[PDB]
Amino acid sequence: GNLSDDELEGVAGG
Amino acid sequence: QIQPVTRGRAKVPVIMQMEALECGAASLAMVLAYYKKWVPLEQVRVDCGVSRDGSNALNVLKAARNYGLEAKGYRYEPEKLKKEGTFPCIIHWNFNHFVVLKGFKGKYAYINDPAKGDVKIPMEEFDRSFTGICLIFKPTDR
């Protein structure tokens, strides 16, 4: 939406 | 025919993570189940790329897209999530975790947490626990 693919790739969770 | 909810809360079935690293996959499984896209949970884990670092938002979104959902990632402050969010959506939680946001009512956020089941979070706690990242889904042709 307002985030690039690389920024989304760094959002991580279990 | 099932659309996202923009007004109240989405009725979303509870799926628990079978182990701690799986929250991403459990959360997308619940979103898939809301739209009645039947995909074995084992398949979802593998398509989300569950690793020793859990999953990441880019891979959750890519897996959702291959299953026929339109999927976008936003950074929202809490107040704009409340205003413009659609439900269910997946949200990043304590910098660690993914949960499914079903919506808001009163002083409460309604979540399916893969570690806890269906919970009601007080707004103040919601506001500190939501990190800002929100994955927003819509069915296929548009």
Residue numbers in the entry:
A (entry chain M): 1 to 14
B (entry chain A): 5 to 146
Sentences from the paper on this structure:
Following the installation of these posttranslational modifications, the cognate AMS/PCAT catalyzes the removal of the leader peptide via cleavage at the double Gly motif and extracellular secretion of the bioactive natural product. Here, we identified and characterized LahT150, a sequence tolerant protease domain of the full-length AMS/PCAT LahT.
We therefore synthesized peptide 1 representing the C-terminal 13 amino acids of the ProcA2.8 leader peptide with an aldehyde in the terminal position. A shorter construct, including residues 1–147 (hereafter LahT147; as identified by secondary structure analysis) and a TEV cleavable His6-tag, was used for crystallography. Incubation of peptide 1 with LahT147 prior to crystallization yielded crystals of the binary complex that diffracted to 2.0 Å resolution. The crystallographic asymmetric unit contains four copies of the complex allowing for multiple independent and unbiased views of the protein-peptide complex structure. Clear and continuous density corresponding to the peptide aldehyde 1 can be observed bound covalently to Cys27 as a thiohemiacetal in all four crystallographically independent molecules. The peptide binds in a groove formed between helices α1–α3 and the central antiparallel β-sheet. In contrast, residues Val−4 through Ser−11 form a short two-turn helix, which positions residues Val−4, Leu−7, and Leu−12 of the leader peptide into a hydrophobic groove in LahT150, located roughly 20 Å away from the active site.
